[PDB]
């Protein structure tokens, strides 16, 4: 492992909003498969699924289109049609209250699923451990 095992409580038998910290923005998933953040509670792609594949392994997904979060090459994040290797988050408990995401493919190299004050997503490289754009609390919707 390159990265600690502190789980975050909670299941995955319901939907979830995931929650921003650092600007208020519920992550989304757009049609087009573009990936931000929206402040806006009524959005209809902020509806993600998440699952387990092996512990403390999730995959995200939007429910409104079925598409899965992912991290590409060059660590920006966008939403796949279909399960793919890059789909892969460490979900891990943080700061001993939230949760973070760590792209598997990217572990080594600690690349985050992170969100700016903007509402904007970050690139892999760009985020680290301590940051706020990190950190993501998951509300039931």
């Known amino acids: 492992h390159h990265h600690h095992f502190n789980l975050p409580p ?9 929650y921003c910290s650092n600007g ?38 939007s429910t409104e289109t079925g598409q899965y979060l992912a991290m590409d090459t060059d660590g920006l994040l966008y939403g796949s049609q279909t399960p793919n290797e890059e789909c892969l988050f460490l979900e891990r408990l943080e700061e001993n209250h939230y949760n973070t995401y760590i792209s598997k493919k990217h572990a080594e190299k600690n690349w985050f699923l992170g969100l700016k ?10 985020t ?5 754009a ?8």
Request: proline share 7%; charged share 25%.
């Open 10 to 18: 909670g299941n995955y038998k319901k939907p979830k909003l995931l």
């Open 24 to 61: 208020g923005h519920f992550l989304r998933i757009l049609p087009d498969g573009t990936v931000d953040g929206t402040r806006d509670r009524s959005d209809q792609h902020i509806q993600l699924q998440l699952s387990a594949e092996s512990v403390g392994e999730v995959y995200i997904k």
């Open 117 to 126: 004050k903007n509402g904007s997503c970050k690139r892999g490289p760009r």
């Open 128 to 132: 680290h451990y301590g940051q706020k």
């Open 134 to 141: 990190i950190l993501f609390l998951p509300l039931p919707v």
